[PDB]
């Protein structure tokens, strides 16, 4: 369970690598990258960045035989979440992975993210059956989508 | 928190003016602030942007060169000023502050005065 | 940079269903916002990020788009609806407006 992780240029490569019992090794490598709006507070825009990447970590550790499979298209990726900058209050997070065969992925967490600290994954779960945004006007929060298109390659 | 502007009123062609904004409610510190003009009839055009401290001063291209933009000493004021003014400049100016964050917008549209030439 | 909208003036009917439209001249990565004016008053955010509605507005009030094509969409007009309504760019330290589009009944 290697993981490896570069930035350049608000560019960042994510890379999950496992030994084979062939006696060979295969990674598989990700890139995608982000931009930051000078209008939008930037505490909550690093948070979700940080929070891409241990989604996605997760979902490759998951799935890593599959996403070995998966050598081509570039896939996309949603976010939808309501991330806040503030210990008091959970964060919850939504992934999906969208194939170029027509697969999707699903993953779905909870997580505090203390402002000046790496942001911590909890034992609390997402509610399948409540829609999010629902959920952002009982505890009022800003709801956040972005989109990724990542290029999943592996070693040969 | 309130916005207001001062200077304004009739002045003739190829003169030059000075508008400000002024702000009580809060410190003009974290983000920049905007002007906007309205040409009766018009839509509404955004003209330049500052920034606490140091700044990206950038102008609309279509009137560059004519005017500069510049922030006070404390005293929470935003300074314009205008040279070679032409009658296409006759518009109503505002001022403008927009920042997001988690919690939502903020916009505090101001109420300016007229400027004709 | 360039933004552009193409409803122009419309008239309607009290409770028509209205939508309006925006186009970017470049990709802005979902970062355009509404501004609704009426006469005599400043203007006043509506929508923003294209996809969430600003606080106090009533429900009727939604809008959605891509990344280079957006509508916003008041799904029954009301006597208190008539304005002057505006598209803007959000990608930058500087900020542009669309040619706006007017809203009238009868």
């Known amino acids: 369970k290697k993981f490896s992780v570069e930035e350049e240029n608000n560019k960042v490569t994510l890379t999950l690598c496992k030994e084979k019992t062939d006696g060979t090794v295969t990674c598989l490598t990700v890139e995608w990258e982000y931009e930051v709006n000078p209008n939008v507070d930037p505490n909550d825009q690093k948070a979700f960045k940080e929070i891409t990447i241990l989604s996605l970590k997760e979902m490759l550790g998951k799935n890593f035989e599959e996403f070995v499979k998966l050598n081509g298209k570039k896939l996309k990726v949603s976010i939808k979440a309501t991330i806040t900058s503030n210990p008091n209050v959970d964060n919850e997070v939504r992934l999906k992975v969208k194939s170029e065969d027509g697969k999707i992925f699903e993953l779905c967490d909870m997580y505090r993210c203390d402002p000046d600290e790496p942001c911590i994954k909890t034992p609390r779960k997402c509610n399948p059956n409540v829609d999010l945004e629902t959920i952002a006007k009982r505890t009022g929060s800003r709801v956040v989508e972005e989109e990724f298109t990542m290029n999943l390659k592996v070693e040969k | 928190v309130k916005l207001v502007e001062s200077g304004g009123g009739v002045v003739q062609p190829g003169r030059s003016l000075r508008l400000s904004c002024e702000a009580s409610?809060?410190?003009?510190?974290?983000?920049?602030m905007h002007w906007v003009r309205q040409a009766p009839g018009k839509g509404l055009e955004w003209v330049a942007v500052?920034?606490?401290?140091?700044?990206?001063?950038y102008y609309a291209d279509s009137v560059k060169g004519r005017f500069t933009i510049s922030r006070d000493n404390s005293k929470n004021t935003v300074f314009m000023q205008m040279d070679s003014l032409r009658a296409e400049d006759t518009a109503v100016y505002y001022c403008?502050?927009?920042?997001?964050?988690?919690?939502?917008?903020?916009?505090?549209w101001g109420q300016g005065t007229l400027v004709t030439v | 940079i360039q933004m552009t909208q193409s409803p122009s003036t419309l008239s309607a009917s009290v409770g028509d269903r209205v939508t309006i439209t925006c186009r970017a001249s470049?990709?802005?990565?979902?970062?355009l916002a509404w501004y609704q004016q009426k006469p005599g008053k400043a203007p006043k955010l509506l929508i923003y990020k294209a996809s969430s509605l600003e606080s106090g507005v009533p429900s009727r009030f939604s809008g959605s788009g891509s990344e280079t094509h957006f509508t916003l969409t008041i799904s029954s007009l009301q006597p208190d609806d008539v304005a002057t309504y505006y598209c803007?760019?959000?990608?930058?330290?500087?900020?542009?407006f669309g040619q706006g589009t007017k809203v009238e009944i009868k």
């Open positions: 803007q760019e959000y990608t930058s330290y500087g900020r542009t």
């Open positions: 403008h502050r927009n920042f997001y964050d988690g919690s939502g917008p903020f916009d505090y």
């Open positions: 470049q990709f802005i990565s979902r970062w």
């Open positions: 500052i920034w606490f401290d140091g700044s990206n001063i």
């Open positions: 409610g809060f410190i003009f510190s974290t983000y920049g």
